[PDB]
């Protein structure tokens with residue numbers, strides 16, 4: 001998709017741990033972190049954090065049951081976030097992010113550190129704007 | 145100050161808990177969260193997260209000893225962050241953010257939720273651009 005308010009939110013597993021990945025669809029910009037466990041509390045918290053930082057209008061996921069908890073629904077309600085239905089189920093940021101995580105894995109002891117390093121590398125890499133430059137360009141243009 | 149790479153990073157205390165607050169100096173845009181405890185590990189982790197999301201060149205703090213830990217220094221080294229020395233010690237986002245936190249405190253059980261709600265309110269409030277609009281404007285203009 002390409003609307004500037006659309007985000008994709010999924011969890012991946014690595015080293016018996018859970019990584020929450022949010023992708024700004026229009027830009028490829030990512031935010032991610034290791035979460036203690038795959039729960040509605042964690043997801044709702046991540047969403048509130050995301051919505052305070054970017055203009056999040058709609059969120060899609062590849063696992064719809066991710067968004068059934070009362071806590072998630074309350075976070076989306078409070079922040080004014082809707083579920084995206086204009087993206088069908090049939091990218092692979094998860095493999096690409098895991099590729100980068102594997103590249104920097106030894107640069108840190110804890111996976112959570114490695115994940116942030118990978119996010120940094122992903123968002124700054126030019127290919128020629130970076131995802132980080134693209135998101136601010138897309139959002140700033142959408143204001144004016 | 146007004147350079148687009150300058151951030152201010154402090155901790156506040158509330159309800160026997162610790163809130164890490166990062167302020168984009170040029171825009172007034174904030175990121176914050178409740179951290180388990182006031183440690184170098186927590187600060188370094190916050191900094192890596194921040195640097196992967198925004199172009200962080202320099203960081204100032206009101207408590208210089210915040211940045212003495214080996215872990216913090218390594219995070220700044222890795223991300224290419226320098227300590228800001230162009231801002232002297234003699235804003236009050238901490239009182240203003242605590243004001244908003246107190247306004248929404250009952251809207252959530254856990255302080256960490258309240259804090260994100262306050263960040264959201266702060267960043268979206270027009271006064272007439274919002275801090276959230278100002279930061280993307282400042283950063284996007286600084287690319288082109």
Ligand SMILES: O=C(O)Cc1c(-c2ccccc2)c2cc(Cl)ccc2[nH]c1=O
Nearest residue numbers: 107108109110113188214215218219222
């Ligand atoms: O390895 C981790 O997961 C973070 C970490 C780092 C570190 C911080 C930034 C980049 C890479 C590693 C660290 C670094 C030093 Cl010089 C000493 C203790 C340290 N202790 C830690 O826990």
Ligand SMILES: O=C(O)Cc1c(-c2ccccc2)c2cc(Cl)ccc2[nH]c1=O
Nearest residue numbers: 044070071074075078251252253254257
């Ligand atoms: O109160 C918290 O700190 C978060 C939270 C919320 C909540 C989520 C977003 C905004 C406000 C509160 C919640 C909401 C419902 Cl409808 C049910 C269980 C819930 N349980 C929780 O832990």
Ligand SMILES: [Ca+2]
Nearest residue numbers: 068069070071
């Ligand atoms: Ca319930």
Ligand SMILES: [Ca+2]
Nearest residue numbers: 212213214215
């Ligand atoms: Ca040491």
Ligand SMILES: [Cl-]
Nearest residue numbers: 107108109110
């Ligand atoms: Cl280490």
Ligand SMILES: [Cl-]
Nearest residue numbers: 251252253254
């Ligand atoms: Cl509650």
